[PDB]
Amino acid sequence: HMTPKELLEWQTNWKKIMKRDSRIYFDITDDVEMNTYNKSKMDKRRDLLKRGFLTLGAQITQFFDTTVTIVITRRSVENIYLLKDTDILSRAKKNYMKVWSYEKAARFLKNLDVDIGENIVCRVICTTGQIPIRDLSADISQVLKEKRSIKKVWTFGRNPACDYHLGNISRLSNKHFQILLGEDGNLLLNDISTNGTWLNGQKVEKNSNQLLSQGDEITVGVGVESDILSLVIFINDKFKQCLEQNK
Protein backbone atom coordinates (compact mmCIF):
# COMPACT_ATOMS: atom_id res chain seq x y z
CA HIS A 1 0.00 0.00 0.00
CA MET A 2 3.18 2.02 0.06
CA THR A 3 4.41 2.49 -3.50
CA PRO A 4 7.44 0.37 -4.46
CA LYS A 5 9.46 3.58 -4.50
CA GLU A 6 8.25 4.60 -1.05
CA LEU A 7 9.02 1.21 0.47
CA LEU A 8 12.49 1.28 -1.08
CA GLU A 9 13.08 4.70 0.44
CA TRP A 10 11.86 3.33 3.77
CA GLN A 11 14.44 0.55 3.42
CA THR A 12 17.30 2.85 2.40
CA ASN A 13 16.76 5.02 5.47
CA TRP A 14 16.55 2.11 7.90
CA LYS A 15 19.68 0.55 6.43
CA LYS A 16 21.54 3.75 7.30
CA ILE A 17 20.04 3.83 10.81
CA MET A 18 21.10 0.25 11.46
CA LYS A 19 24.66 1.04 10.44
CA ARG A 20 25.03 4.34 12.32
CA ASP A 21 22.39 5.02 15.00
CA SER A 22 21.34 1.59 16.25
CA ARG A 23 22.16 -0.11 19.54
CA ILE A 24 20.08 -3.22 20.25
CA TYR A 25 19.49 -5.09 23.51
CA PHE A 26 18.00 -8.59 23.69
CA ASP A 27 15.66 -9.24 26.63
CA ILE A 28 16.93 -12.17 28.73
CA THR A 29 13.74 -12.64 30.74
CA ASP A 30 11.08 -15.18 29.73
CA ASP A 31 7.42 -14.92 30.75
CA VAL A 32 6.60 -18.63 30.30
CA GLU A 33 8.48 -21.56 31.82
CA MET A 34 9.89 -23.79 29.06
CA ASN A 35 11.69 -27.12 28.92
CA THR A 36 15.38 -26.70 28.11
CA TYR A 37 14.47 -27.81 24.58
CA ASN A 38 12.16 -24.98 23.51
CA LYS A 39 14.47 -22.67 25.42
CA SER A 40 17.56 -23.70 23.45
CA LYS A 41 15.45 -23.38 20.31
CA MET A 42 14.59 -19.78 21.14
CA ASP A 43 18.24 -19.20 22.10
CA LYS A 44 19.26 -20.42 18.65
CA ARG A 45 16.68 -18.03 17.22
CA ARG A 46 18.16 -15.20 19.28
CA ASP A 47 21.66 -15.89 17.95
CA LEU A 48 20.32 -15.79 14.39
CA LEU A 49 18.69 -12.41 15.00
CA LYS A 50 21.92 -11.09 16.55
CA ARG A 51 23.99 -12.17 13.54
CA GLY A 52 21.40 -10.62 11.25
CA PHE A 53 21.53 -7.22 12.92
CA LEU A 54 25.32 -7.34 13.11
CA THR A 55 25.41 -7.79 9.33
CA LEU A 56 23.47 -4.53 9.07
CA GLY A 57 26.15 -2.84 11.17
CA ALA A 58 24.13 -2.35 14.35
CA GLN A 59 25.64 -2.40 17.83
CA ILE A 60 24.60 -5.21 20.18
CA THR A 61 24.73 -4.13 23.82
CA GLN A 62 24.60 -6.78 26.55
CA PHE A 63 23.14 -4.33 29.08
CA PHE A 64 19.89 -2.41 29.15
CA ASP A 65 21.69 0.90 29.15
CA THR A 66 21.30 4.59 28.56
CA THR A 67 21.88 4.26 24.79
CA VAL A 68 19.49 1.46 23.71
CA THR A 69 17.41 2.22 20.63
CA ILE A 70 15.67 -1.16 20.23
CA VAL A 71 14.73 -3.92 22.65
CA ILE A 72 14.13 -7.37 21.15
CA THR A 73 12.13 -9.74 23.36
CA ARG A 74 10.40 -13.12 23.26
CA ARG A 75 7.79 -12.05 25.78
CA SER A 76 4.38 -10.56 25.00
CA VAL A 77 4.77 -7.02 23.70
CA GLU A 78 1.02 -6.49 23.96
CA ASN A 79 0.91 -7.46 27.65
CA ILE A 80 3.74 -5.19 28.83
CA TYR A 81 1.19 -3.04 30.66
CA LEU A 82 0.75 -6.03 33.01
CA LEU A 83 4.43 -6.25 34.00
CA LYS A 84 6.08 -4.87 37.13
CA ASP A 85 7.34 -1.27 37.03
CA THR A 86 10.86 -2.62 37.49
CA ASP A 87 10.62 -4.69 34.31
CA ILE A 88 12.98 -3.67 31.48
CA LEU A 89 10.10 -3.86 28.98
CA SER A 90 7.93 -1.58 31.11
CA ARG A 91 10.68 1.03 31.46
CA ALA A 92 11.58 0.90 27.77
CA LYS A 93 7.94 1.34 26.78
CA LYS A 94 7.08 4.24 29.07
CA ASN A 95 10.22 5.92 27.73
CA TYR A 96 9.03 5.32 24.16
CA MET A 97 11.73 2.83 23.25
CA LYS A 98 11.22 0.52 20.29
CA VAL A 99 10.19 -2.93 21.55
CA TRP A 100 9.98 -5.76 19.01
CA SER A 101 8.98 -9.40 19.23
CA TYR A 102 11.22 -12.01 17.60
CA GLU A 103 8.72 -12.27 14.75
CA LYS A 104 8.84 -8.53 14.15
CA ALA A 105 12.64 -8.49 14.28
CA ALA A 106 12.94 -11.34 11.79
CA ARG A 107 10.51 -9.58 9.45
CA PHE A 108 12.58 -6.40 9.67
CA LEU A 109 15.77 -8.30 8.85
CA LYS A 110 14.02 -9.91 5.89
CA ASN A 111 12.94 -6.46 4.71
CA LEU A 112 16.60 -5.35 4.76
CA ASP A 113 17.66 -8.21 2.55
CA VAL A 114 18.82 -10.44 5.43
CA ASP A 115 17.11 -13.73 6.29
CA ILE A 116 22.49 -25.41 -13.42
CA GLY A 117 22.16 -25.11 -17.20
CA GLU A 118 18.37 -24.82 -17.34
CA ASN A 119 16.74 -21.53 -18.36
CA ILE A 120 14.02 -19.54 -16.61
CA VAL A 121 10.58 -20.30 -18.02
CA CYS A 122 8.67 -17.91 -15.76
CA ARG A 123 8.92 -15.95 -12.52
CA VAL A 124 6.23 -16.37 -9.86
CA ILE A 125 5.64 -13.42 -7.52
CA CYS A 126 3.26 -13.81 -4.59
CA THR A 127 1.44 -10.50 -4.16
CA THR A 128 -0.37 -11.63 -1.01
CA GLY A 129 3.05 -12.16 0.55
CA GLN A 130 2.97 -15.67 2.02
CA ILE A 131 5.67 -16.92 -0.36
CA PRO A 132 9.00 -15.53 -1.63
CA ILE A 133 9.68 -15.12 -5.36
CA ARG A 134 10.41 -18.39 -7.16
CA ASP A 135 11.38 -19.14 -10.77
CA LEU A 136 10.10 -21.99 -12.91
CA SER A 137 12.91 -23.39 -15.05
CA ALA A 138 13.47 -26.08 -17.68
CA ASP A 139 16.45 -27.50 -19.56
CA ILE A 140 16.36 -26.37 -23.18
CA SER A 141 18.00 -29.67 -24.15
CA GLN A 142 15.42 -31.89 -22.43
CA VAL A 143 12.54 -29.75 -23.72
CA LEU A 144 13.52 -30.05 -27.39
CA LYS A 145 14.05 -33.81 -27.14
CA GLU A 146 10.47 -34.24 -25.92
CA LYS A 147 7.98 -34.88 -28.74
CA ARG A 148 4.87 -34.78 -26.54
CA SER A 149 2.84 -31.56 -26.68
CA ILE A 150 3.50 -30.98 -22.97
CA LYS A 151 7.22 -30.51 -22.35
CA LYS A 152 7.04 -30.18 -18.56
CA VAL A 153 4.62 -29.94 -15.64
CA TRP A 154 4.88 -27.88 -12.44
CA THR A 155 2.42 -28.74 -9.66
CA PHE A 156 1.21 -26.26 -7.04
CA GLY A 157 -0.25 -27.52 -3.78
CA ARG A 158 -0.29 -27.82 -0.01
CA ASN A 159 1.79 -30.99 -0.28
CA PRO A 160 5.38 -29.85 0.43
CA ALA A 161 6.71 -32.40 -2.10
CA CYS A 162 5.09 -30.50 -4.99
CA ASP A 163 7.18 -28.27 -7.25
CA TYR A 164 5.67 -25.18 -5.59
CA HIS A 165 4.43 -25.28 -2.00
CA LEU A 166 1.32 -23.11 -1.60
CA GLY A 167 1.70 -23.27 2.17
CA ASN A 168 -0.30 -25.33 4.66
CA ILE A 169 -3.89 -24.15 4.30
CA SER A 170 -6.56 -26.80 4.91
CA ARG A 171 -8.85 -25.40 2.20
CA LEU A 172 -6.15 -25.86 -0.46
CA SER A 173 -5.54 -29.20 -2.15
CA ASN A 174 -2.39 -31.30 -1.85
CA LYS A 175 -2.24 -30.81 -5.60
CA HIS A 176 -4.16 -27.63 -6.38
CA PHE A 177 -3.20 -26.58 -9.91
CA GLN A 178 -0.46 -27.15 -12.46
CA ILE A 179 1.51 -25.06 -14.91
CA LEU A 180 2.28 -26.90 -18.15
CA LEU A 181 5.01 -26.01 -20.62
CA GLY A 182 3.49 -25.86 -24.09
CA GLU A 183 5.55 -26.47 -27.21
CA ASP A 184 6.78 -22.96 -28.14
CA GLY A 185 7.31 -21.65 -24.61
CA ASN A 186 3.56 -21.39 -24.17
CA LEU A 187 2.31 -21.85 -20.60
CA LEU A 188 -1.02 -23.38 -19.60
CA LEU A 189 -2.92 -23.30 -16.31
CA ASN A 190 -4.67 -26.50 -15.25
CA ASP A 191 -6.90 -26.60 -12.19
CA ILE A 192 -7.08 -30.00 -10.48
CA SER A 193 -8.19 -28.68 -7.09
CA THR A 194 -11.21 -29.35 -4.93
CA ASN A 195 -12.14 -25.77 -4.03
CA GLY A 196 -11.15 -24.22 -7.36
CA THR A 197 -8.66 -21.86 -8.99
CA TRP A 198 -9.06 -18.33 -10.37
CA LEU A 199 -7.33 -16.58 -13.27
CA ASN A 200 -7.44 -12.78 -13.36
CA GLY A 201 -10.47 -12.99 -11.07
CA GLN A 202 -12.38 -15.62 -13.03
CA LYS A 203 -12.91 -19.20 -11.88
CA VAL A 204 -11.33 -21.51 -14.45
CA GLU A 205 -12.91 -24.76 -15.61
CA LYS A 206 -11.48 -27.74 -13.74
CA ASN A 207 -9.15 -30.04 -15.70
CA SER A 208 -9.11 -27.53 -18.55
CA ASN A 209 -5.89 -26.10 -19.99
CA GLN A 210 -6.02 -22.29 -20.18
CA LEU A 211 -3.27 -20.31 -21.89
CA LEU A 212 -1.30 -18.02 -19.56
CA SER A 213 -0.37 -14.43 -20.39
CA GLN A 214 2.09 -11.83 -19.10
CA GLY A 215 1.17 -10.58 -15.63
CA ASP A 216 -1.68 -13.06 -15.22
CA GLU A 217 -2.83 -13.40 -11.62
CA ILE A 218 -3.58 -16.87 -10.29
CA THR A 219 -5.57 -16.84 -7.06
CA VAL A 220 -6.58 -19.71 -4.78
CA GLY A 221 -8.42 -19.93 -1.47
CA VAL A 222 -11.22 -17.65 -2.65
CA GLY A 223 -14.20 -17.59 -0.30
CA VAL A 224 -12.17 -17.00 2.86
CA GLU A 225 -10.43 -13.63 2.77
CA SER A 226 -7.42 -14.84 4.78
CA ASP A 227 -6.87 -18.05 2.78
CA ILE A 228 -6.53 -16.03 -0.43
CA LEU A 229 -3.17 -16.48 -2.17
CA SER A 230 -2.37 -14.58 -5.38
CA LEU A 231 0.46 -15.52 -7.75
CA VAL A 232 1.49 -13.27 -10.65
CA ILE A 233 3.15 -14.93 -13.63
CA PHE A 234 5.88 -13.15 -15.59
CA ILE A 235 6.90 -15.19 -18.62
CA ASN A 236 10.53 -15.08 -19.76
CA ASP A 237 10.56 -14.21 -23.46
CA LYS A 238 14.20 -15.16 -23.96
CA PHE A 239 13.32 -18.76 -23.15
CA LYS A 240 11.50 -18.87 -26.47
CA GLN A 241 14.68 -17.58 -28.12
CA CYS A 242 17.12 -20.04 -26.56
CA LEU A 243 14.61 -22.64 -27.78
CA GLU A 244 14.56 -21.23 -31.32
CA GLN A 245 18.35 -20.90 -31.18
CA ASN A 246 18.99 -24.55 -30.34
CA LYS A 247 16.85 -26.09 -33.09
Partner: peptide, 9 residues
Protein backbone atom coordinates in the same frame (compact mmCIF):
# COMPACT_ATOMS: atom_id res chain seq x y z
CA UNK B 1 0.93 -34.13 6.79
CA UNK B 2 -0.75 -34.53 3.41
CA UNK B 3 -4.20 -34.36 4.98
CA UNK B 4 -7.51 -34.53 3.14
CA UNK B 5 -8.66 -31.18 1.76
CA UNK B 6 -11.28 -29.13 3.57
CA UNK B 7 -14.07 -29.07 0.97
CA UNK B 8 -16.34 -26.04 0.62
CA UNK B 9 -20.12 -26.36 0.39
Amino acid sequence: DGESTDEDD
